[PDB]
Scaffold this motif. Structure first.
Motif, PDB file in Angstrom:
ATOM      1  N   UNK A  90       0.851  -1.205   0.000  1.00 29.89           N
ATOM      2  CA  UNK A  90       0.000   0.000   0.000  1.00 29.89           C
ATOM      3  C   UNK A  90       0.883   1.250   0.000  1.00 29.89           C
ATOM      4  N   UNK A  91       0.405   2.345  -0.586  1.00 30.22           N
ATOM      5  CA  UNK A  91       1.180   3.580  -0.637  1.00 30.22           C
ATOM      6  C   UNK A  91       0.332   4.774  -0.249  1.00 30.22           C
ATOM      7  N   UNK A  92       0.973   5.748   0.387  1.00 29.80           N
ATOM      8  CA  UNK A  92       0.288   7.000   0.667  1.00 29.80           C
ATOM      9  C   UNK A  92       0.526   7.934  -0.514  1.00 29.80           C
ATOM     10  N   UNK A  93      -0.538   8.507  -1.091  1.00 27.34           N
ATOM     11  CA  UNK A  93      -0.404   9.365  -2.273  1.00 27.34           C
ATOM     12  C   UNK A  93       0.269  10.717  -1.988  1.00 27.34           C
TER      13      UNK A  93
ATOM     14  N   UNK B 112      -6.191  11.058  -6.749  1.00 25.41           N
ATOM     15  CA  UNK B 112      -5.700   9.719  -6.420  1.00 25.41           C
ATOM     16  C   UNK B 112      -5.257   8.945  -7.639  1.00 25.41           C
ATOM     17  N   UNK B 113      -4.104   8.297  -7.514  1.00 27.01           N
ATOM     18  CA  UNK B 113      -3.528   7.471  -8.572  1.00 27.01           C
ATOM     19  C   UNK B 113      -3.695   6.006  -8.214  1.00 27.01           C
TER      20      UNK B 113
ATOM     21  N   UNK C 170      -2.033   3.539  -7.209  1.00 24.20           N
ATOM     22  CA  UNK C 170      -0.725   3.321  -6.593  1.00 24.20           C
ATOM     23  C   UNK C 170      -0.109   1.951  -6.880  1.00 24.20           C
ATOM     24  N   UNK C 171      -0.853   0.859  -6.625  1.00 23.68           N
ATOM     25  CA  UNK C 171      -0.383  -0.522  -6.812  1.00 23.68           C
ATOM     26  C   UNK C 171      -0.009  -0.769  -8.257  1.00 23.68           C
TER      27      UNK C 171
ATOM     28  N   UNK D 259      -1.627   3.342   7.325  1.00 26.19           N
ATOM     29  CA  UNK D 259      -1.984   4.586   6.627  1.00 26.19           C
ATOM     30  C   UNK D 259      -3.225   5.186   7.222  1.00 26.19           C
TER      31      UNK D 259
ATOM     32  N   UNK E 291      -5.000   7.695   6.531  1.00 27.08           N
ATOM     33  CA  UNK E 291      -5.382   8.576   5.436  1.00 27.08           C
ATOM     34  C   UNK E 291      -6.861   8.381   5.130  1.00 27.08           C
TER      35      UNK E 291
ATOM     36  N   UNK F  86      -6.050   6.404  -0.713  1.00 30.40           N
ATOM     37  CA  UNK F  86      -5.623   4.991  -0.569  1.00 30.40           C
ATOM     38  C   UNK F  86      -5.138   4.754   0.848  1.00 30.40           C
ATOM     39  N   UNK F  87      -5.471   3.575   1.384  1.00 25.27           N
ATOM     40  CA  UNK F  87      -5.250   3.285   2.797  1.00 25.27           C
ATOM     41  C   UNK F  87      -4.607   1.907   2.995  1.00 25.27           C
ATOM     42  N   UNK F  88      -4.576   1.389   4.224  1.00 24.45           N
ATOM     43  CA  UNK F  88      -4.000   0.083   4.484  1.00 24.45           C
ATOM     44  C   UNK F  88      -5.101  -0.931   4.186  1.00 24.45           C
ATOM     45  N   UNK F  89      -4.929  -1.689   3.098  1.00 22.13           N
ATOM     46  CA  UNK F  89      -5.908  -2.682   2.679  1.00 22.13           C
ATOM     47  C   UNK F  89      -5.541  -3.992   3.348  1.00 22.13           C
TER      48      UNK F  89
END
Lengths: 362, 362
Positions: A23-26, A239-240, A242-243, B4, B6, B9-12
């Motif tokens: 997971x990534x923070x944008x 939002x992109x 990310x994955x 995350x 946030x 996008x968050x911790x899935x």
């Protein structure tokens, strides 16, 4: 389970898919600077060895990047000249129609390359034209369009060149600065072999700067999107995926690892020629003459045998581990076989055996 | 590595990310009928227990779905009334501006709930208004906007209601048919806890049918997108982010497994209240009065201590495994902490300890 012999989304490598497990923070520098900005830097170098170019990544289907380009680059008084020799050229004309952009289409038919003379005549007789668009590999048929001569004619007439390199960039060597391409659009999930989620545009900085305040869409505002990545070091305005962006970073590492676009082109070209020879030995006829073939995807006429049915043939191939593709030609009964993604000469040889066993009507 | 905190996008979860490890053909019935159509069916049932609603999935950021809605639902003679009490209401006004759609913004401050009297005065004095837009959870501050009275007022004036439920749908119980919502827009990667890649619109079937031939974008043509998914049972017109769609299918199974939106709402609400009480015990003050708090994300005033710096505080929290979020309020110095995704009461307790250890200025 299956090899996807599609033009993309295709069979990606295990490492490309495994790169999606984080997971990534944008709003995090680890994503923006260490993933996004790295992709951006690598993409420009893959497109040209010259200076003056820049990249912009855009969320959505590749069509969203084609549309971002048309709707951002063409001014209110602008006019597009498009080569429509398949569904993706027709889609470019359809985008211009939606955006109320005057559009002149040069239509040689779906089995023919555009006649340079026809393009030259349109450029000489229609001064209102400001932009020209062409599809590099016309995926509808797998036709390889003559983009060099077309872009050369366009530049000699002082027009802005837009290239839809969706199914070619990463698989067919090109230097967009040398060809005089102003905006080159491509995909995350075709020849680079990433996964779908976004597209990108590699553009001449000076031509991209002209896009400011011209966009017909907020989401598809090319200059605004680029400006934010520039000022905010990779940051996507919205939002992109990310994955999928991280999977694309992995796809770029694997392209280098393979030996770059030159090595990928050789594998694709070999797969495609071996495929054509194999199909011909089984009595299949390519839609296009070999000189027009791209090394990406090939359309073949459907067998005329009364018991032939695409779905039954498709099902028999799927049972053997191969996913083939439907035809996209309006006046022909045909099917397509892509040879990109995790497709190697051994797979093509196994595929030729599989097509033979799938020929239930013989 | 990090939790995350946030708005997405968050911790899935591991299973949501693991669902991305398979490639799909976009022309395959298994993907379209057994993944896409299942998501579509589930989304309508999550949004309403009533008949007459349908869903549309759209590639891109959630902003692309908000834009697809505005640009497809509003006719050439249409006019939008928007509640702008944060960045997402302002973004809706920005979309209308890009699309040359007349727009009236009823703009309260970012720390006040919308003034129904202002909306009512706009509706009574501006007959040209055809559409009303409101953000359910204004993520800028974490404000939970009253939407029921606003939607009731809009319907009593015969307007089409658009709800930006990007950060609320899946986390806050709502029945869009009961509320009189014509188009509800939400995300794959916020309260449903999927990964970014696409957004969706849950719309009153009859209101969606009015979108035909009115789109301002091909990519964002809501009716065309829906029509293809209808006639071709899940088929997306252009390439979809297949892996992220499959991850979303998994996110829907996990929401069901948790006990639905009611149970997710309970966990989020508990996390949020525990967070607020913990932050207050450490001397932090929430930007908004408690009655306005959403259970999704909370804005807190930045400490006034001269040595406080968001980046240093953010870095010290990241070192402890927590990713907090920047403030977005224009007229206050704030930071935000989300509590959605793989955030449980134990994480909030651990975060309160981590918040304390990161308070380097005291």
């Amino acid at each position: 389970e299956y090899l996807l012999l599609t033009p993309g989304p295709l069979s990606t490598s295990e490492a490309v898919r495994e790169a999606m497990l984080k997971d990534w923070c944008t709003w995090d520098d680890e994503y923006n600077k260490d993933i996004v900005e790295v992709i951006r830097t690598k993409l420009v170098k893959l497109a040209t060895k010259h200076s003056g170019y820049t990249s912009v990544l855009m969320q959505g289907s590749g069509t969203a990047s084609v549309e971002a380009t048309i709707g951002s680059a063409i001014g209110k008084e602008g006019k597009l000249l498009v080569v429509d020799n398949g569904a993706y050229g027709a889609r470019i004309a359809q985008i211009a129609d939606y955006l109320n952009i005057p559009c002149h289409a040069v239509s040689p038919g779906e089995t023919s390359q555009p006649h340079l003379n026809e393009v030259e005549t349109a450029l000489a007789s229609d001064p209102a034209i400001t932009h020209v668009a062409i599809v590099h590999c016309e995926t509808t048929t797998g036709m390889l369009n003559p983009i060099e001569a077309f872009a050369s004619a366009a530049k000699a007439h002082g027009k802005v060149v837009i290239l839809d390199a969706m199914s070619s960039f990463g698989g067919i060597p090109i230097d967009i600065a040398e060809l005089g391409i102003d905006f080159m659009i491509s995909s995350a999930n075709k020849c680079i072999q990433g996964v779908p989620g976004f597209g990108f545009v590699i553009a001449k900085k000076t031509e991209l700067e002209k896009c400011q305040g011209q966009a017909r869409s907020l989401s598809l505002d090319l200059y605004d999107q680029w400006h934010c990545m520039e000022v905010n070091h990779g940051k996507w305005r919205f939002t992109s995926p990310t994955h999928t962006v991280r999977a694309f970073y992995q796809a770029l590492l694997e392209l280098e690892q393979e030996g770059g676009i030159e090595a990928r082109h050789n594998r694709y070209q070999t797969n495609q020629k071996t495929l054509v020879a194999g199909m011909r030995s089984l009595g299949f006829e390519p839609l296009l003459s070999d000189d027009l073939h791209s090394p990406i995807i090939t359309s073949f006429y459907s067998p005329t045998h009364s018991d032939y049915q695409f779905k039954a043939f498709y099902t028999r191939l799927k049972e053997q581990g191969f996913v083939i593709y439907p035809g996209k030609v309006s006046n022909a009964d045909c099917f397509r076989i892509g040879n990109i993604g995790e497709v190697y000469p051994a797979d093509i040889e196994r595929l030729i055996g599989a097509i033979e066993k799938a020929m239930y009507w013989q």
